[PDB]
Amino acid sequence: VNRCIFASIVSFDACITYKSPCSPDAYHDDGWFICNNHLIKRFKMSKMVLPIFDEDDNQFKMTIARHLVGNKERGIKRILIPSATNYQDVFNLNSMMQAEQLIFHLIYNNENAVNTICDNLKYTEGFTSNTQRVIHSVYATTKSILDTTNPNTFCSRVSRDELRFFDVTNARALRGGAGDQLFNNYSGFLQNLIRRAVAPEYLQIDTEELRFRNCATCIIDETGLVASVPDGPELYNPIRSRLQIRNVLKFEGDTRELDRTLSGYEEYPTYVPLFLGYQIINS
Amino acid sequence: MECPFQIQVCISDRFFAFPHNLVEPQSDVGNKLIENLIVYVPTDDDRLYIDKKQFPKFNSVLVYRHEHDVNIDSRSPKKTASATIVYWNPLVPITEIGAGETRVFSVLLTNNLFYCNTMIVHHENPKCPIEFTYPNLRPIACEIPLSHFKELVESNDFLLCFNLETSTMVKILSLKRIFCIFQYRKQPARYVINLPHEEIDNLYNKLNWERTRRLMKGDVPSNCATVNRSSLKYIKQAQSLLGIPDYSQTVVDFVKMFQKIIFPYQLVPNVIIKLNNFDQMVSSAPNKAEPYKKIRLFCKNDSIAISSSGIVPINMPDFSPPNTFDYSDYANRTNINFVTQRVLTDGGFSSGITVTPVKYNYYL
Ligand SMILES: [Zn+2]
């Protein structure tokens, strides 16, 4: 059994076959329906887990992700996700394969263009072939995910009790503003995935309000998600796996064997976590 | 149990909203009016809709969530006339009563309320609503009534939910309220519910008990109700085997369609026969294997009736023990066998043939 959307996608033709497919994580049941491979390849993120204490070592855990964007890029580059306003230009879909573009327009409910292409394809041999069946199976998957819950049960409960304020931690950060109000607008698949991706900075329960970071790592965005600090210069993001200047004015640093002395000491990681506002919970 | 003496039940579906008007200050003998009044509700949430200003008659009004105590539990509740008491849509038996006769105003007859002085002030709502299931939609919170008020006026396509902890009693209550308000509504809106629903079919059976309980004193409404799974799938198969101009077509459609033709053939459609057959209980009833519930079917001015098993004369036990019996000089095994041999020979058939002689009830 496999459930990554990209694993569900199949090539229209033998060439451009989906080699480099979804990893084994596609089989797994995080409920994100996306291989971390494709999360990288399309969004510059890597999923992670936050362990949590049930006031105890007794297991509690929550999914998270790191972004992969470098410190120096601005604008479109920083945009992690688009709106329906701008997804077309962000993706340059015509670069992407027609099935990919199809799927994206389904995600944005551009039914006009979607069915226009469908109507053109109808009598094409490649679409009298079961590609139509493929697409309607992805439609059934969408139904089974969203109409079952995402804009339905999940929207209902999120608008009934345990909302997260996806909101500015401190009102002086007016650049963030009430953009949480825009969370209402997106397709329920996207809203769900966003909620699953991003942690709050806080949780309230009858057991106390818990503060998981001092200061927000992110900001809300005018169209779709954009990696940026709420304040100041962007914090340094390192990156892991041409006629350019690459000066690094390093300290001379003759103190060799540093790690051979220090390696026992804790090797503090650096990758950027994700925090936003307040979750609320009853028991 | 029973209702303790000096308590009365008023049912009204309208009581789904609090009837602020009706209540009057109780007084003891000697006209000792009790303007102190206390009211009890399923939840604190109920209080948020209820307005002190509506009751100038009283100087002192208080409201609390009910909680089922232990130590006062009694067939005869404690008495405290010093304050008027009211319970509104109460769930569970009450251990304490106010001045004079206490009264409760509720939509729903709990079993606790059976052996009770009761009034209903009922009226028929003609408009049966409907469910629908597709697998645009209005997300309706599964409990709060007025959160979506006027949305239930405007739309017809209502999604429903529940939280995991919910008391089944609360579920029933909310569903009842929704159905009442729908029956007040002017068009048959469509239910949609996101639940495993097997327990919902159980709760439907509960509703059946409830409606019968009401009918013990009720308006004998022609209230619509249906088996919701066995029936459901069967009718779906029926439509599928037929042409499907509307997969959404209501059962009652087909029902009436057969109604058009039953009388001219004076005999029972297999659809209706399978109905009252494959219900768990109201049927041939695999609950207890009770085909004995044969239908006697009658129409205006008839001298005769249509049983499950052919025409019958009126008001008699379905078949005479005496008859022009199926005398064994017919249905002699030997003859049957011979005929069968003939038939099988001619057909060249090796297997799958069985025959049985017909039999007759009152009439031939
Ligand atoms: Zn994938």
mmCIF file of C-alpha atoms and ligand atoms in Angstrom, chain A residues 4-7 21-23 26 34-35 38, ligand 1:
data_model
loop_
_atom_site.group_PDB
_atom_site.id
_atom_site.type_symbol
_atom_site.label_atom_id
_atom_site.label_comp_id
_atom_site.label_asym_id
_atom_site.label_seq_id
_atom_site.Cartn_x
_atom_site.Cartn_y
_atom_site.Cartn_z
ATOM 1 C CA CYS A 4 2.268 9.583 -1.459
ATOM 2 C CA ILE A 5 0.541 11.728 -4.066
ATOM 3 C CA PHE A 6 3.708 11.688 -6.163
ATOM 4 C CA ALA A 7 3.770 7.897 -5.946
ATOM 5 C CA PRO A 21 10.213 7.838 -7.497
ATOM 6 C CA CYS A 22 8.916 8.328 -3.982
ATOM 7 C CA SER A 23 11.075 6.707 -1.302
ATOM 8 C CA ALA A 26 5.502 6.943 0.741
ATOM 9 C CA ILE A 34 4.117 13.178 0.298
ATOM 10 C CA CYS A 35 7.551 11.598 0.205
ATOM 11 C CA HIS A 38 9.275 15.309 -3.263
HETATM 12 ZN ZN ZN C 1 6.396 11.270 -3.685
#
